[PDB]
Symmetry: C3
Subunit: 85 residues, 3 copies
């Protein structure tokens, strides 16, 4: 089983709106960590998706909607051996 | 020749018990990060770097067999290059 | 379509500014810093459009420290990068 990991790094304030985007898309497990750019006023999302299309779907939505007016970093990579509960 | 990274995302309460499995299997070294997760940061993220896929598989089966049914737990594996430690 | 390298440096908190300046001076866009535990460490994630640039930052860092500071570092690749 190949799984995709979508990282979104944005500003703390966007925690609730970006979480909501993630759920309403139907994610299978997302994690958040606190982070600092160049104070831990940023947050890092890690969203695991069964298809590259859903990862692309969530990335497109967050970019189109917040990429311009907020500091944002997003990227995708593949992972193996997902066991999730 | 190949380094593998094993991620275990689980409840903060298993920090000692998961740390024990990781140590008793004799890994290249690990880091733990506070985190929060859904479908405050009450979870922990282990990143375990192993010299072989088999060792990573072995730490992972164990954790899974022991704690997966009863605790929120996410785990998966991927490859890294250029490891200095 | 767009292959990108991600350098991870996990090191003692005491070296924040030092390695931050190595990452700066080496010309990389920026980075992310996460607090971690080994006790208390920082984890840098640096994105480079060139594998070249990742290994320079790696070289200088492990050159100076590593031999008398706790240090883990490694590289991998990501794709579909967007940044602002």
């Amino acid at each position: 089983q190949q799984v995709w990991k979508l990282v979104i790094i944005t500003e703390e304030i966007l925690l609730k709106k970006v979480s909501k985007i993630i759920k309403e898309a139907g994610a299978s497990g997302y994690t958040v960590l606190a982070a600092a750019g160049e104070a831990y006023s940023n947050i890092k999302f890690e969203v695991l998706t069964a298809s590259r299309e859903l990862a692309d779907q969530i990335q497109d939505k967050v970019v189109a909607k917040y990429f311009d007016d907020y500091s944002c970093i997003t990227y995708i990579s593949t992972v193996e051996a997902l066991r999730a509960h």
